Design a protein around this ligand. Structure first.
Ligand SMILES: NC[C@@H]1O[C@H](O[C@H]2[C@@H](O)[C@H](O[C@@H]3[C@@H](O)[C@H](N)C[C@H](N)[C@H]3O[C@H]3O[C@H](CO)[C@@H](O)[C@H](O)[C@H]3N)O[C@@H]2CO)[C@H](N)[C@@H](O)[C@@H]1O
Ligand SMILES: [Mg+2]
Ligand SMILES: [Mg+2]
Ligand SMILES: [Mg+2]
Ligand SMILES: [Mg+2]
Ligand SMILES: [Mg+2]
Ligand SMILES: [Mg+2]
Ligand SMILES: [Mg+2]
Ligand SMILES: [Mg+2]
Ligand SMILES: [Mg+2]
Ligand SMILES: [Mg+2]
Ligand SMILES: [Mg+2]
Ligand SMILES: [Mg+2]
Ligand SMILES: [Mg+2]
Ligand SMILES: [Mg+2]
Ligand SMILES: [Mg+2]
Ligand SMILES: [Mg+2]
Ligand SMILES: [Mg+2]
Ligand SMILES: [Mg+2]
Ligand SMILES: [Mg+2]
Ligand SMILES: [Mg+2]
Ligand SMILES: [Mg+2]
Ligand SMILES: [Mg+2]
Ligand SMILES: [Mg+2]
Ligand SMILES: [Mg+2]
Ligand SMILES: [Mg+2]
Ligand SMILES: [Mg+2]
Ligand SMILES: [Mg+2]
Ligand SMILES: [Mg+2]
Ligand SMILES: [Mg+2]
Ligand SMILES: [Mg+2]
Ligand SMILES: [Mg+2]
Ligand SMILES: [Mg+2]
Ligand SMILES: [Mg+2]
Ligand SMILES: [Mg+2]
Ligand SMILES: [Mg+2]
Ligand SMILES: [Mg+2]
Ligand SMILES: [Mg+2]
Ligand SMILES: [Mg+2]
Ligand SMILES: [Mg+2]
Ligand SMILES: [Mg+2]
Ligand SMILES: [Mg+2]
Ligand SMILES: [Mg+2]
Ligand SMILES: [Mg+2]
Ligand SMILES: [Mg+2]
Ligand SMILES: [Mg+2]
Ligand SMILES: [Mg+2]
Ligand SMILES: [Mg+2]
Ligand SMILES: [Mg+2]
Ligand SMILES: [Mg+2]
Ligand SMILES: [Mg+2]
Ligand SMILES: [Mg+2]
Ligand SMILES: [Mg+2]
Ligand SMILES: [Mg+2]
Ligand SMILES: [Mg+2]
Ligand SMILES: [Mg+2]
Ligand SMILES: [Mg+2]
Ligand SMILES: [Mg+2]
Ligand SMILES: [Mg+2]
Ligand SMILES: [Mg+2]
Ligand SMILES: [Mg+2]
Ligand SMILES: [Mg+2]
Ligand SMILES: [Mg+2]
Ligand SMILES: [Mg+2]
Ligand SMILES: [Mg+2]
Ligand SMILES: [Mg+2]
Ligand SMILES: [Mg+2]
Ligand SMILES: [Mg+2]
Ligand SMILES: [Mg+2]
Ligand SMILES: [Mg+2]
Ligand SMILES: [Mg+2]
Ligand SMILES: [Mg+2]
Ligand SMILES: [Mg+2]
Ligand SMILES: [Mg+2]
Ligand SMILES: [Mg+2]
Ligand SMILES: [Mg+2]
Ligand SMILES: [Mg+2]
Ligand SMILES: [Mg+2]
Ligand SMILES: [Mg+2]
Ligand SMILES: [Mg+2]
Ligand SMILES: [Mg+2]
Ligand SMILES: [Mg+2]
Ligand SMILES: [Mg+2]
Ligand SMILES: [Mg+2]
Ligand SMILES: [Mg+2]
Ligand SMILES: [Mg+2]
Ligand SMILES: [Mg+2]
Ligand SMILES: [Mg+2]
Ligand SMILES: [Mg+2]
Ligand SMILES: [Mg+2]
Lengths: 124, 138
RNA sequence: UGUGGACCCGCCCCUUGGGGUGUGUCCAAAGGGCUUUGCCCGCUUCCGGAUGGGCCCGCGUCCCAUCAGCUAGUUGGUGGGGUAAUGGCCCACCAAGGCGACGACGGGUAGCCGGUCUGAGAGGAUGGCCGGCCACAGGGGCACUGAGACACGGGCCCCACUCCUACGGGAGGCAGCAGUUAGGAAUCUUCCGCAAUGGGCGCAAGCCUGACGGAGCGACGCCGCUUGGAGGAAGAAGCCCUUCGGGGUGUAAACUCCUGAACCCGGGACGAAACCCCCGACGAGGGGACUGACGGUACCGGGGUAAUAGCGCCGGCCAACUCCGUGCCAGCAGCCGCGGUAAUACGGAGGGCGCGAGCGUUACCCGGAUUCACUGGGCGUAAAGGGCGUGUAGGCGGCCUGGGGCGUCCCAUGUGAAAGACCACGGCUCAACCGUGGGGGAGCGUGGGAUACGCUCAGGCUAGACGGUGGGAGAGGGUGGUGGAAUUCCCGGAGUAGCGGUGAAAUGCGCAGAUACCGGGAGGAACGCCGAUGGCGAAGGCAGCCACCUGGUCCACCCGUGACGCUGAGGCGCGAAAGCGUGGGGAGCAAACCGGAUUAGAUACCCGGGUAGUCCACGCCCUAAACGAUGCGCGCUAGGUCUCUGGGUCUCCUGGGGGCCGAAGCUAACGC
RNA sequence: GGCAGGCGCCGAGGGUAGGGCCCGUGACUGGGGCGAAGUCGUAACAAGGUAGCUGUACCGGAAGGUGCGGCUGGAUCACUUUCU
């Protein structure tokens, strides 16, 4: 546009849309499970995915995913969530942190333990 | 009515050179004249002249190119590879003596009008003046 | 008492209420202590200084125009009130003003800054420690005291909340230090000390100080440091591969020797020398005494133990591959993607890669992203040219001369606190951290200077633009009138068995005589050939002929004016078709609809009917593949050729317009 | 002459009549977006088997059809047969 045009209007700074309204900005938010469900994935992937409709301290009812071999969540499990797209399940935008509150660390895991929150197994 | 006559001249030139004319008429004005004087000094044009195409005054500018080359496409190298208006109407561009451009590490000029006259980048640096950055040529 | 000062009036200089001056009036004071006539601490008035402040102004300071109008103390004036002081700060009377597209008013969000993070920069983001300013102290008002407050730990009142209550009435305010509770993903001790530095009062002794100096807690961050060092096999065992020969972990381990975190023992700080007291004079100077929370810590010395390693990753991006297990499951996944029985992508294992007292995750900011492009992008077909005009504000503006010097440039100067940032030397054994010094800095103020460009004012010019005179082509627009061909209908004639329609048919029309043919009449709509490869128009769009009324345009002459120009937010007007209103009209055609066919079905394509509409007037509507999908204007950059329309010396030159091919060049290509 | 006291203005907030704005809740209802292998057809891409798109107007289970006008971003010297 002309210089004079850029003088009359201007350029226009952009705006970031949060891929995670975990309100408060916060890195995590606590909630209570209201549904532990199973979800069919998409496009070219079939399986049975673990998911939990979670009612957040932020006054938000959002569906969060339950990573790991298997879980232990029930329709009153208090749970801590953390943001993360599950590519396959569309509309699932946060993960449940595993090892915090009612959700228990993945049992008998040896590899990537901090994700899945399971303590160093003992040895002597 | 030409909106910017300095730029119409910088262009007329650029268009002529690009098809290797001999020379070219730009309508006359002291200022345009004042500029070409510099182009000559620094060797971008052979010369200029005050011809008179039908009643009204022009400046015949005579162009200078390279020698013929060998290969497909002989067309000689331009002496004026590049010549661009820096300050245009409705966006004037003034620089202080501290921020006068170093054009192509100096294998090229920048022409600026100052209160001490139309000068090159090195000319204004000595004299210690800034002005209105008119064009770079290199 | 009047050094002096305040006030009214007059004069003087000054120039806003600054400084002098003459009458008149008005205004002072506090005592205390002594190593008591002579000093110490106080008091009064005035002038000056230092510090600290009030007020006023230029410029700067986020998002929404899906907020466009706003204002009545509003805007100004006179007089008064008020204040330390200006002021609609407040008040009375008068005038009718003030602000807004350069964004008023409203709505949203927000303490601002020095700085911080990022970035090559220009920029973007932020205002958390520290420092500066501001505002606030449960919410709302208000004044009093005072140099200062409208006053966090002062007062009054109303409100909400808690607690006491003898029912009337009271008491509170941690956004001070700790601490509790609530909320939350999440954020510390109800610690030591006034030793230092700083503050208040005091002549001092001193007193007060949750300022402050320290310690405590938390890998929250930065820096430093350890978990050892040298030797040590053709190379244990276990675990893992394998082509069954071997290969790997691996000098790793064991083991040999050496050093000696931890831990013990002894010495033990710096920060502190002033206030005070003595001599000298209560001054300069010299002499002496007191005092350490941190802390028996830091640092030194002697003794001395081989003494924590995790975390993530290994399909590509991206450093690192092998076995087993699982079978579109279980699961992974930042994006691409892995898993459907041989998975280097899932889970384990061996091995490997990267960091390491940390390693990952999530969240957020800048970066890469020239992905809001000032630097530094685009719009023929990728997203993007407004449907077209007319024109307002605004932006932009040919040639020559002169004045000013607003922009612009230059010199000198003031400002740009500290911290932080840069560089050097230095202190802690290093660094983190800290000290001293140096350097740089945008911006704004003031004095001086330059005038090429831009602005401005004053002349001049003719090359832009406009006009005169003379010619020209055109479906450019409006109103009236008129011509023939055809369709349908009516009247007459002649004539008889079908016509019509389709792939084929059938609805349909025809003995009330159709179709075909001749003659006459009515009406409505469109204008064949010419006619396109053409013309006109800003676009939509314009086609029989005649006349009238009008618009644009092009050529020649080189006559007039003298930059009168370009673009154009908003405004205004125009704007295919369909659609709407009122009235008229209605041949043909025809959404809807009614039938006939076709089909698996047929709300369709095909056939026979048929209303709105298509037509006219007036008034709306305002859209489009409103297309060249290409804004308008001006300048420059080979040519060939076809065509429409002017002019001149007319084989050829020279304009305006419409096509094609092509130079340079441009383009992602196509193409231009 | 002062003080107490009295009256008045201003005045926090409260009340009543009417407005404008923002948030919550909401019986009903509108369409949207996602989700390997449900149903109807077959509108579009080849002349998509009626060239397509288009503004508008009516109609239709559904894509869609038709009217009017526009566009080429339409194939070629001569036909009607859904799906995967
Ligand atoms: N997202 C689809 C959008 O919605 C419509 O499409 C929606 C429906 O029409 C469509 O239905 C299809 C159906 O056509 C098709 N013949 C069968 C198919 N199973 C269906 O698919 C749907 O349903 C199944 C479960 O029943 C899901 O597994 C599947 O994800 C979903 N697409 O599924 C879509 C919703 O996912 C619009 N027509 C379409 O233009 C548009 O893209
Ligand atoms: Mg993993
Ligand atoms: Mg006196
Ligand atoms: Mg005076
Ligand atoms: Mg006086
Ligand atoms: Mg006097
Ligand atoms: Mg007296
Ligand atoms: Mg005495
Ligand atoms: Mg002062
Ligand atoms: Mg008034
Ligand atoms: Mg007044
Ligand atoms: Mg008014
Ligand atoms: Mg705030
Ligand atoms: Mg950048
Ligand atoms: Mg701060
Ligand atoms: Mg409070
Ligand atoms: Mg308090
Ligand atoms: Mg208390
Ligand atoms: Mg809690
Ligand atoms: Mg102290
Ligand atoms: Mg002190
Ligand atoms: Mg070793
Ligand atoms: Mg030893
Ligand atoms: Mg030793
Ligand atoms: Mg002391
Ligand atoms: Mg003495
Ligand atoms: Mg001394
Ligand atoms: Mg060892
Ligand atoms: Mg690799
Ligand atoms: Mg399984
Ligand atoms: Mg991420
Ligand atoms: Mg396998
Ligand atoms: Mg396989
Ligand atoms: Mg693997
Ligand atoms: Mg991977
Ligand atoms: Mg950028
Ligand atoms: Mg782009
Ligand atoms: Mg487009
Ligand atoms: Mg256009
Ligand atoms: Mg358009
Ligand atoms: Mg104008
Ligand atoms: Mg000019
Ligand atoms: Mg101008
Ligand atoms: Mg001048
Ligand atoms: Mg100036
Ligand atoms: Mg500084
Ligand atoms: Mg920096
Ligand atoms: Mg050092
Ligand atoms: Mg200056
Ligand atoms: Mg000056
Ligand atoms: Mg001058
Ligand atoms: Mg003039
Ligand atoms: Mg004429
Ligand atoms: Mg005509
Ligand atoms: Mg008859
Ligand atoms: Mg019959
Ligand atoms: Mg009969
Ligand atoms: Mg007939
Ligand atoms: Mg007849
Ligand atoms: Mg009739
Ligand atoms: Mg045209
Ligand atoms: Mg057209
Ligand atoms: Mg005319
Ligand atoms: Mg003339
Ligand atoms: Mg003249
Ligand atoms: Mg215009
Ligand atoms: Mg119209
Ligand atoms: Mg119409
Ligand atoms: Mg009508
Ligand atoms: Mg009608
Ligand atoms: Mg009628
Ligand atoms: Mg029909
Ligand atoms: Mg019909
Ligand atoms: Mg009309
Ligand atoms: Mg319009
Ligand atoms: Mg051009
Ligand atoms: Mg002729
Ligand atoms: Mg031409
Ligand atoms: Mg044309
Ligand atoms: Mg080429
Ligand atoms: Mg381009
Ligand atoms: Mg090409
Ligand atoms: Mg009273
Ligand atoms: Mg089809
Ligand atoms: Mg087609
Ligand atoms: Mg309908
Ligand atoms: Mg449709
Ligand atoms: Mg229909
Ligand atoms: Mg059509
Ligand atoms: Mg398109």
């Amino acid at each position: 546009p002309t210089i004079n045009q850029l003088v009359r209007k201007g350029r226009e700074k952009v705006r970031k849309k949060s891929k995670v309204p975990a309100l408060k900005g916060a890195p995590f938010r606590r909630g209570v499970c209201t549904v532990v469900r199973t979800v069919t994935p998409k496009k070219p992937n079939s399986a049975l995915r673990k998911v939990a409709k979670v009612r957040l301290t932020s006054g938000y009812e959002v569906t969060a995913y339950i990573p790991g071999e298997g879980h232990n969540l029930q329709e009153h499990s208090v749970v801590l969530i953390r943001g993360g797209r599950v590519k396959d399940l569309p509309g699932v935008r946060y993960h449940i942190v595993r090892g915090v509150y009612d959700a228990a660390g993945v049992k008998d895991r040896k590899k990537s333990r901090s994700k899945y929150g399971t303590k160093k197994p003992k040895e002597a | 009515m030409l909106t910017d006559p300095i730029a119409d001249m910088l262009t007329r030139i650029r268009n002529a050179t690009r098809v290797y004319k001999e020379s070219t008429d730009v309508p006359a004005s002291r200022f345009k004249e004042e500029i070409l004087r510099i182009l000559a000094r620094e060797g971008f044009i052979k010369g200029y002249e005050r011809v008179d195409v039908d009643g009204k005054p022009y400046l015949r500018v005579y162009l200078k190119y390279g020698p013929r080359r060998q290969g497909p496409d002989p067309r000689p190298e331009q002496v004026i590879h590049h010549i661009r208006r820096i300050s245009k109407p409705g966006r004037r561009v003034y620089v202080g003596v501290k921020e006068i451009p170093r054009v192509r590490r100096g294998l090229g000029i920048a022409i600026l009008s100052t209160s001490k006259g139309v000068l090159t980048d090195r000319e204004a640096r000595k004299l210690g003046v800034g002005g209105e950055l008119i064009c770079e040529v290199w």
